[PDB]
Design a protein around this ligand. Structure first.
Ligand SMILES: [Ca+2]
Ligand SMILES: [Ca+2]
Lengths: 233, 215
Protein backbone atom coordinates (compact mmCIF):
# COMPACT_ATOMS: atom_id res chain seq x y z
CA UNK A 1 0.00 0.00 0.00
CA UNK A 2 0.85 3.68 -0.54
CA UNK A 3 2.16 6.34 1.86
CA UNK A 4 0.19 9.22 3.41
CA UNK A 5 1.22 12.03 1.01
CA UNK A 6 1.69 9.98 -2.21
CA UNK A 7 0.35 12.69 -4.57
CA UNK A 8 2.62 15.52 -3.34
CA UNK A 9 5.65 13.21 -3.74
CA UNK A 10 4.65 12.45 -7.35
CA UNK A 11 4.18 16.11 -8.31
CA UNK A 12 7.63 17.38 -7.24
CA UNK A 13 9.37 14.20 -8.50
CA UNK A 14 8.10 14.69 -12.05
CA UNK A 15 8.63 18.49 -11.86
CA UNK A 16 12.40 17.73 -11.66
CA UNK A 17 12.16 15.09 -14.44
CA UNK A 18 9.69 16.57 -16.98
CA UNK A 19 7.08 19.22 -15.92
CA UNK A 20 4.82 18.39 -18.93
CA UNK A 21 4.18 14.89 -17.45
CA UNK A 22 3.54 15.94 -13.83
CA UNK A 23 -0.27 16.11 -13.89
CA UNK A 24 -0.63 12.80 -15.77
CA UNK A 25 1.89 11.05 -13.47
CA UNK A 26 0.22 12.37 -10.27
CA UNK A 27 -3.05 10.79 -11.54
CA UNK A 28 -1.24 7.46 -12.20
CA UNK A 29 -0.01 7.49 -8.55
CA UNK A 30 -3.57 8.28 -7.35
CA UNK A 31 -4.85 5.36 -9.46
CA UNK A 32 -2.32 2.99 -7.87
CA UNK A 33 -3.12 4.31 -4.36
CA UNK A 34 -6.81 3.38 -4.92
CA UNK A 35 -5.88 0.16 -6.82
CA UNK A 36 -2.65 -1.22 -5.14
CA UNK A 37 -2.72 -4.65 -6.89
CA UNK A 38 -1.89 -2.86 -10.20
CA UNK A 39 1.32 -1.47 -8.61
CA UNK A 40 4.47 -3.26 -9.87
CA UNK A 41 8.13 -3.24 -8.85
CA UNK A 42 10.23 -1.22 -11.33
CA UNK A 43 12.21 -3.27 -13.86
CA UNK A 44 15.95 -2.77 -13.28
CA UNK A 45 15.19 -0.66 -10.18
CA UNK A 46 13.63 -3.25 -7.82
CA UNK A 47 15.71 -1.87 -4.87
CA UNK A 48 12.82 0.59 -4.20
CA UNK A 49 9.75 -1.08 -2.61
CA UNK A 50 6.29 -0.57 -4.21
CA UNK A 51 4.52 2.27 -2.34
CA UNK A 52 7.44 4.11 -0.66
CA UNK A 53 8.58 7.67 -1.42
CA UNK A 54 11.74 6.24 -3.02
CA UNK A 55 9.62 4.15 -5.41
CA UNK A 56 7.49 7.18 -6.35
CA UNK A 57 10.63 9.20 -7.20
CA UNK A 58 12.18 6.30 -9.16
CA UNK A 59 8.81 5.71 -10.91
CA UNK A 60 8.98 9.32 -12.19
CA UNK A 61 12.20 8.70 -14.13
CA UNK A 62 10.88 5.29 -15.26
CA UNK A 63 7.56 6.80 -16.43
CA UNK A 64 9.40 9.43 -18.54
CA UNK A 65 12.03 6.91 -19.81
CA UNK A 66 9.17 4.76 -21.13
CA UNK A 67 8.14 7.64 -23.41
CA UNK A 68 11.58 8.24 -25.01
CA UNK A 69 11.68 6.83 -28.58
CA UNK A 70 12.86 3.20 -28.88
CA UNK A 71 15.04 2.27 -31.84
CA UNK A 72 14.11 -1.02 -33.60
CA UNK A 73 16.89 -3.34 -32.44
CA UNK A 74 17.81 -6.73 -33.92
CA UNK A 75 19.02 -8.98 -31.07
CA UNK A 76 22.77 -9.18 -30.38
CA UNK A 77 22.50 -13.02 -30.16
CA UNK A 78 25.07 -14.42 -32.60
CA UNK A 79 23.11 -16.65 -35.02
CA UNK A 80 23.57 -20.43 -35.20
CA UNK A 81 25.54 -21.51 -38.29
CA UNK A 82 23.47 -24.73 -38.45
CA UNK A 83 20.37 -22.58 -39.18
CA UNK A 84 22.12 -21.58 -42.42
CA UNK A 85 23.04 -25.22 -43.12
CA UNK A 86 19.30 -26.10 -42.92
CA UNK A 87 18.26 -23.14 -45.13
CA UNK A 88 20.86 -24.15 -47.73
CA UNK A 89 20.60 -27.97 -47.54
CA UNK A 90 16.82 -28.50 -46.96
CA UNK A 91 15.03 -25.28 -47.97
CA UNK A 92 17.26 -24.62 -51.02
CA UNK A 93 18.07 -21.00 -50.09
CA UNK A 94 21.04 -20.06 -52.32
CA UNK A 95 24.38 -20.26 -50.49
CA UNK A 96 25.44 -16.68 -51.37
CA UNK A 97 22.23 -15.22 -49.83
CA UNK A 98 22.60 -17.07 -46.50
CA UNK A 99 24.23 -14.07 -44.79
CA UNK A 100 21.40 -11.83 -46.04
CA UNK A 101 18.71 -14.28 -44.78
CA UNK A 102 20.51 -14.38 -41.44
CA UNK A 103 20.37 -10.57 -41.15
CA UNK A 104 16.75 -10.15 -42.27
CA UNK A 105 15.81 -12.89 -39.74
CA UNK A 106 17.41 -10.73 -37.01
CA UNK A 107 15.81 -7.53 -38.36
CA UNK A 108 12.45 -9.35 -38.45
CA UNK A 109 12.89 -10.31 -34.74
CA UNK A 110 13.79 -6.68 -34.00
CA UNK A 111 10.71 -5.48 -35.88
CA UNK A 112 8.57 -7.98 -33.88
CA UNK A 113 9.94 -6.87 -30.47
CA UNK A 114 9.08 -3.15 -30.97
CA UNK A 115 5.59 -3.46 -32.59
CA UNK A 116 3.91 -3.91 -29.19
CA UNK A 117 5.51 -0.70 -27.96
CA UNK A 118 4.58 1.31 -31.10
CA UNK A 119 0.94 0.11 -30.70
CA UNK A 120 0.87 1.76 -27.25
CA UNK A 121 2.42 4.93 -28.66
CA UNK A 122 -0.10 5.16 -31.49
CA UNK A 123 -3.00 4.67 -29.07
CA UNK A 124 -1.49 7.20 -26.61
CA UNK A 125 -1.17 9.95 -29.28
CA UNK A 126 -4.87 9.50 -30.15
CA UNK A 127 -6.42 9.13 -26.64
CA UNK A 128 -4.21 11.32 -24.36
CA UNK A 129 -5.73 14.53 -25.87
CA UNK A 130 -9.08 13.38 -24.38
CA UNK A 131 -7.73 12.73 -20.82
CA UNK A 132 -6.65 9.05 -20.96
CA UNK A 133 -3.13 8.35 -19.65
CA UNK A 134 -0.65 5.93 -21.21
CA UNK A 135 1.01 4.10 -18.33
CA UNK A 136 4.54 4.18 -19.75
CA UNK A 137 7.42 2.22 -18.23
CA UNK A 138 6.76 -0.67 -15.84
CA UNK A 139 5.27 0.84 -12.63
CA UNK A 140 1.75 -0.40 -13.61
CA UNK A 141 0.97 -4.13 -14.02
CA UNK A 142 -1.81 -5.37 -16.36
CA UNK A 143 -3.16 -1.90 -17.20
CA UNK A 144 -1.71 0.05 -20.15
CA UNK A 145 -4.05 3.08 -20.01
CA UNK A 146 -6.15 4.79 -17.30
CA UNK A 147 -8.88 7.45 -17.19
CA UNK A 148 -10.78 9.16 -14.37
CA UNK A 149 -14.07 9.61 -16.25
CA UNK A 150 -16.74 12.35 -16.06
CA UNK A 151 -18.38 10.38 -13.16
CA UNK A 152 -14.99 10.22 -11.29
CA UNK A 153 -14.77 6.47 -11.86
CA UNK A 154 -11.43 4.93 -12.87
CA UNK A 155 -11.46 3.34 -16.34
CA UNK A 156 -8.54 1.10 -17.33
CA UNK A 157 -7.37 -0.56 -20.53
CA UNK A 158 -4.97 -3.38 -21.48
CA UNK A 159 -3.77 -3.85 -25.06
CA UNK A 160 -1.90 -6.80 -26.63
CA UNK A 161 -0.58 -6.95 -30.21
CA UNK A 162 -1.77 -10.55 -30.70
CA UNK A 163 -4.39 -12.80 -29.02
CA UNK A 164 -1.60 -15.31 -28.23
CA UNK A 165 0.81 -12.56 -26.99
CA UNK A 166 3.01 -14.02 -24.27
CA UNK A 167 2.87 -11.58 -21.33
CA UNK A 168 -0.74 -11.94 -20.17
CA UNK A 169 -1.55 -10.14 -16.93
CA UNK A 170 -4.45 -9.27 -14.64
CA UNK A 171 -4.78 -7.05 -11.55
CA UNK A 172 -7.67 -6.59 -9.13
CA UNK A 173 -9.63 -3.32 -9.24
CA UNK A 174 -10.72 -2.13 -5.80
CA UNK A 175 -12.29 1.10 -7.17
CA UNK A 176 -13.30 1.24 -10.87
CA UNK A 177 -14.83 -0.81 -13.69
CA UNK A 178 -13.20 -4.08 -14.84
CA UNK A 179 -10.03 -3.77 -16.97
CA UNK A 180 -10.97 -3.58 -20.66
CA UNK A 181 -8.81 -6.07 -22.59
CA UNK A 182 -8.20 -5.80 -26.35
CA UNK A 183 -5.83 -7.43 -28.90
CA UNK A 184 -4.87 -6.00 -32.33
CA UNK A 185 -4.25 -9.13 -34.43
CA UNK A 186 -5.16 -12.84 -34.60
CA UNK A 187 -2.70 -15.75 -34.45
CA UNK A 188 -5.31 -18.09 -35.99
CA UNK A 189 -6.04 -15.88 -39.05
CA UNK A 190 -5.37 -12.75 -41.13
CA UNK A 191 -7.05 -9.39 -40.47
CA UNK A 192 -7.30 -7.03 -37.48
CA UNK A 193 -9.56 -6.43 -34.47
CA UNK A 194 -9.93 -2.61 -34.41
CA UNK A 195 -13.74 -2.94 -34.91
CA UNK A 196 -14.09 -4.27 -31.33
CA UNK A 197 -11.77 -1.70 -29.70
CA UNK A 198 -13.52 -0.73 -26.41
CA UNK A 199 -15.77 2.34 -26.46
CA UNK A 200 -14.17 5.56 -25.20
CA UNK A 201 -13.90 9.20 -26.35
CA UNK A 202 -11.77 9.26 -29.55
CA UNK A 203 -12.38 5.55 -30.44
CA UNK A 204 -13.55 6.41 -34.00
CA UNK A 205 -10.02 7.71 -34.80
CA UNK A 206 -8.36 4.34 -34.03
CA UNK A 207 -7.71 1.87 -36.89
CA UNK A 208 -5.11 -0.29 -38.68
CA UNK A 209 -4.59 2.49 -41.26
CA UNK A 210 -4.11 4.95 -38.38
CA UNK A 211 -1.56 2.58 -36.79
CA UNK A 212 0.21 2.04 -40.12
CA UNK A 213 0.43 5.84 -40.62
CA UNK A 214 1.69 6.35 -37.04
CA UNK A 215 4.47 3.77 -37.64
CA UNK A 216 5.58 5.32 -40.98
CA UNK A 217 5.72 8.73 -39.23
CA UNK A 218 7.56 7.39 -36.13
CA UNK A 219 10.21 5.50 -38.14
CA UNK A 220 10.67 8.41 -40.63
CA UNK A 221 11.21 10.83 -37.72
CA UNK A 222 13.59 8.36 -36.04
CA UNK A 223 15.62 7.78 -39.25
CA UNK A 224 16.00 11.57 -39.58
CA UNK A 225 17.18 11.71 -35.92
CA UNK A 226 19.93 9.11 -36.50
CA UNK A 227 20.98 11.00 -39.66
CA UNK A 228 21.59 14.08 -37.45
CA UNK A 229 23.67 11.94 -35.02
CA UNK A 230 26.27 11.18 -37.75
CA UNK A 231 26.51 14.91 -38.64
CA UNK A 232 26.99 15.76 -34.90
CA UNK A 233 29.15 12.56 -34.53
CA UNK B 1 6.88 -55.10 -11.93
CA UNK B 2 7.15 -51.79 -13.84
CA UNK B 3 10.11 -53.14 -15.86
CA UNK B 4 8.02 -56.08 -17.16
CA UNK B 5 5.05 -53.75 -17.84
CA UNK B 6 7.48 -51.44 -19.68
CA UNK B 7 8.82 -54.39 -21.70
CA UNK B 8 5.32 -55.52 -22.78
CA UNK B 9 4.07 -52.03 -23.63
CA UNK B 10 7.08 -51.39 -25.89
CA UNK B 11 6.85 -54.86 -27.49
CA UNK B 12 3.39 -53.69 -28.63
CA UNK B 13 4.66 -50.36 -30.06
CA UNK B 14 8.22 -51.09 -31.24
CA UNK B 15 10.25 -54.13 -30.05
CA UNK B 16 13.56 -52.56 -31.27
CA UNK B 17 13.26 -49.99 -28.42
CA UNK B 18 12.06 -52.36 -25.66
CA UNK B 19 15.53 -52.76 -24.12
CA UNK B 20 16.29 -48.98 -24.07
CA UNK B 21 12.79 -48.01 -22.87
CA UNK B 22 12.91 -50.53 -19.99
CA UNK B 23 16.21 -49.03 -18.74
CA UNK B 24 14.61 -45.53 -18.94
CA UNK B 25 11.65 -46.79 -16.88
CA UNK B 26 14.19 -48.14 -14.34
CA UNK B 27 15.79 -44.65 -14.27
CA UNK B 28 12.45 -42.91 -13.52
CA UNK B 29 11.62 -45.49 -10.83
CA UNK B 30 14.80 -44.35 -9.03
CA UNK B 31 14.35 -40.64 -9.93
CA UNK B 32 10.57 -39.88 -10.17
CA UNK B 33 10.90 -36.03 -10.31
CA UNK B 34 12.25 -36.40 -13.88
CA UNK B 35 8.96 -38.10 -14.89
CA UNK B 36 6.94 -35.66 -17.03
CA UNK B 37 0.52 -46.95 -12.64
CA UNK B 38 0.46 -49.24 -15.71
CA UNK B 39 -1.35 -46.73 -17.99
CA UNK B 40 1.40 -44.08 -17.71
CA UNK B 41 3.99 -46.61 -18.98
CA UNK B 42 1.85 -47.66 -22.00
CA UNK B 43 1.37 -43.98 -22.94
CA UNK B 44 5.12 -43.27 -22.50
CA UNK B 45 6.09 -46.10 -24.87
CA UNK B 46 4.32 -44.33 -27.75
CA UNK B 47 5.82 -40.92 -26.77
CA UNK B 48 9.39 -42.36 -26.65
CA UNK B 49 8.97 -44.13 -29.99
CA UNK B 50 7.43 -41.01 -31.59
CA UNK B 51 10.53 -38.96 -30.65
CA UNK B 52 12.63 -41.32 -32.82
CA UNK B 53 10.54 -40.69 -35.99
CA UNK B 54 12.43 -38.54 -38.54
CA UNK B 55 11.07 -35.01 -38.16
CA UNK B 56 10.78 -32.61 -41.11
CA UNK B 57 11.91 -28.95 -40.80
CA UNK B 58 8.64 -26.96 -40.86
CA UNK B 59 8.21 -23.20 -40.93
CA UNK B 60 5.60 -22.08 -38.34
CA UNK B 61 1.94 -22.11 -39.48
CA UNK B 62 1.42 -18.63 -37.97
CA UNK B 63 0.13 -15.56 -39.80
CA UNK B 64 2.72 -12.76 -40.11
CA UNK B 65 2.26 -9.32 -38.56
CA UNK B 66 1.87 -6.91 -41.50
CA UNK B 67 3.63 -4.19 -39.46
CA UNK B 68 6.91 -6.22 -39.42
CA UNK B 69 7.17 -5.75 -43.23
CA UNK B 70 6.51 -2.01 -42.78
CA UNK B 71 9.29 -1.71 -40.16
CA UNK B 72 11.68 -3.72 -42.37
CA UNK B 73 10.85 -1.38 -45.28
CA UNK B 74 10.66 1.98 -43.52
CA UNK B 75 13.35 1.65 -40.81
CA UNK B 76 15.91 -0.85 -42.21
CA UNK B 77 15.40 0.11 -45.92
CA UNK B 78 14.45 -3.37 -47.24
CA UNK B 79 12.97 -2.80 -50.75
CA UNK B 80 9.22 -3.26 -51.39
CA UNK B 81 9.90 -6.14 -53.80
CA UNK B 82 12.05 -8.11 -51.31
CA UNK B 83 9.66 -7.89 -48.30
CA UNK B 84 7.77 -11.12 -49.08
CA UNK B 85 11.13 -12.89 -49.54
CA UNK B 86 12.29 -11.54 -46.13
CA UNK B 87 9.04 -12.66 -44.52
CA UNK B 88 9.46 -16.20 -45.87
CA UNK B 89 13.15 -16.55 -44.99
CA UNK B 90 12.23 -15.47 -41.43
CA UNK B 91 9.62 -18.25 -41.28
CA UNK B 92 12.19 -20.69 -42.69
CA UNK B 93 14.83 -19.62 -40.15
CA UNK B 94 12.38 -20.24 -37.27
CA UNK B 95 11.62 -23.74 -38.62
CA UNK B 96 15.37 -24.37 -38.87
CA UNK B 97 15.82 -23.09 -35.29
CA UNK B 98 12.88 -25.24 -34.13
CA UNK B 99 14.60 -28.46 -35.29
CA UNK B 100 18.36 -27.89 -34.60
CA UNK B 101 17.96 -29.05 -30.97
CA UNK B 102 16.36 -32.26 -32.20
CA UNK B 103 19.08 -32.86 -34.81
CA UNK B 104 21.65 -32.27 -32.02
CA UNK B 105 20.09 -35.04 -29.88
CA UNK B 106 19.95 -37.48 -32.81
CA UNK B 107 23.56 -36.85 -33.71
CA UNK B 108 24.66 -37.49 -30.10
CA UNK B 109 22.28 -40.51 -30.06
CA UNK B 110 24.01 -42.00 -33.13
CA UNK B 111 27.42 -41.71 -31.45
CA UNK B 112 26.87 -42.58 -27.75
CA UNK B 113 24.02 -45.18 -27.88
CA UNK B 114 26.42 -47.86 -29.24
CA UNK B 115 28.40 -47.35 -25.98
CA UNK B 116 25.26 -48.18 -23.88
CA UNK B 117 23.94 -44.66 -23.28
CA UNK B 118 20.26 -44.20 -24.02
CA UNK B 119 18.60 -41.28 -25.73
CA UNK B 120 15.53 -40.21 -23.74
CA UNK B 121 13.47 -39.68 -26.90
CA UNK B 122 10.19 -37.74 -26.87
CA UNK B 123 9.14 -35.70 -23.79
CA UNK B 124 8.57 -38.35 -21.09
CA UNK B 125 11.79 -37.29 -19.29
CA UNK B 126 11.84 -33.76 -17.89
CA UNK B 127 15.18 -31.98 -18.52
CA UNK B 128 17.47 -35.03 -18.93
CA UNK B 129 18.16 -36.21 -22.50
CA UNK B 130 20.52 -39.19 -22.07
CA UNK B 131 21.16 -41.75 -19.30
CA UNK B 132 23.59 -44.57 -18.45
CA UNK B 133 23.95 -47.38 -15.88
CA UNK B 134 27.72 -47.49 -15.27
CA UNK B 135 29.76 -50.57 -14.18
CA UNK B 136 28.81 -50.00 -10.49
CA UNK B 137 25.09 -49.39 -11.29
CA UNK B 138 24.92 -45.60 -10.78
CA UNK B 139 22.79 -43.28 -12.95
CA UNK B 140 24.86 -40.82 -14.96
CA UNK B 141 22.54 -38.26 -16.61
CA UNK B 142 23.19 -35.74 -19.42
CA UNK B 143 21.18 -32.64 -20.40
CA UNK B 144 21.89 -31.05 -23.84
CA UNK B 145 20.99 -27.52 -24.97
CA UNK B 146 21.67 -25.91 -28.35
CA UNK B 147 22.50 -22.44 -26.96
CA UNK B 148 23.63 -21.37 -23.45
CA UNK B 149 20.50 -19.15 -23.26
CA UNK B 150 18.26 -21.52 -25.28
CA UNK B 151 14.71 -20.14 -25.06
CA UNK B 152 12.99 -22.62 -22.72
CA UNK B 153 14.41 -24.82 -19.95
CA UNK B 154 12.69 -27.47 -17.79
CA UNK B 155 14.39 -29.03 -14.73
CA UNK B 156 14.24 -32.04 -12.38
CA UNK B 157 15.74 -33.30 -9.10
CA UNK B 158 18.13 -36.27 -8.96
CA UNK B 159 17.02 -38.60 -6.16
CA UNK B 160 19.53 -41.44 -6.79
CA UNK B 161 22.65 -40.97 -8.96
CA UNK B 162 25.32 -38.40 -9.80
CA UNK B 163 24.25 -34.76 -10.59
CA UNK B 164 22.93 -33.80 -14.05
CA UNK B 165 25.89 -33.12 -16.35
CA UNK B 166 24.69 -30.00 -18.17
CA UNK B 167 26.08 -28.88 -21.52
CA UNK B 168 25.35 -26.51 -24.41
CA UNK B 169 26.67 -26.41 -27.98
CA UNK B 170 26.85 -22.68 -28.84
CA UNK B 171 27.12 -19.27 -27.20
CA UNK B 172 24.61 -16.42 -27.46
CA UNK B 173 27.20 -13.61 -27.12
CA UNK B 174 30.30 -14.96 -28.97
CA UNK B 175 31.19 -16.97 -32.07
CA UNK B 176 32.19 -20.65 -32.08
CA UNK B 177 31.24 -23.85 -30.25
CA UNK B 178 31.57 -25.47 -26.79
CA UNK B 179 32.23 -29.10 -27.76
CA UNK B 180 35.56 -28.97 -25.85
CA UNK B 181 33.64 -29.10 -22.52
CA UNK B 182 31.38 -32.06 -23.52
CA UNK B 183 31.05 -34.46 -20.52
CA UNK B 184 33.37 -37.45 -20.11
CA UNK B 185 31.78 -40.73 -21.30
CA UNK B 186 32.30 -43.46 -23.90
CA UNK B 187 32.25 -41.93 -27.41
CA UNK B 188 32.96 -38.31 -26.30
CA UNK B 189 35.99 -38.43 -28.64
CA UNK B 190 33.84 -38.75 -31.82
CA UNK B 191 31.67 -35.68 -30.97
CA UNK B 192 32.52 -32.33 -32.59
CA UNK B 193 31.07 -29.33 -34.40
CA UNK B 194 32.32 -30.91 -37.66
CA UNK B 195 30.80 -34.31 -36.83
CA UNK B 196 27.47 -32.58 -36.18
CA UNK B 197 27.58 -30.56 -39.45
CA UNK B 198 28.33 -33.69 -41.47
CA UNK B 199 25.49 -35.55 -39.66
CA UNK B 200 23.03 -32.72 -40.42
CA UNK B 201 24.00 -32.49 -44.12
CA UNK B 202 23.63 -36.26 -44.57
CA UNK B 203 20.36 -36.20 -42.63
CA UNK B 204 18.86 -33.42 -44.79
CA UNK B 205 20.19 -34.94 -47.99
CA UNK B 206 18.29 -38.15 -47.09
CA UNK B 207 15.07 -36.23 -46.24
CA UNK B 208 15.22 -34.36 -49.58
CA UNK B 209 15.62 -37.66 -51.45
CA UNK B 210 12.56 -39.08 -49.65
CA UNK B 211 10.55 -35.94 -50.58
CA UNK B 212 11.65 -36.26 -54.25
CA UNK B 213 10.30 -39.81 -54.63
CA UNK B 214 7.00 -38.94 -52.88
CA UNK B 215 6.24 -36.00 -55.22
CA1 LIG C 1 -0.18 -6.35 -21.15
CA1 LIG D 1 2.22 -1.96 -19.64
Amino acid sequence: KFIQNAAEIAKKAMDSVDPSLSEKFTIVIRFLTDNPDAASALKGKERSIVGTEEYIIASATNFKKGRDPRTPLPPSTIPDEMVSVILNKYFEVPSEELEKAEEWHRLSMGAENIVGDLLERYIAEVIEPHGWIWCSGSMVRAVDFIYCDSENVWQSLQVKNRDNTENSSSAAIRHGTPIKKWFRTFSKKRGDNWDKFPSLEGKENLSEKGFKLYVEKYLSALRAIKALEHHHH
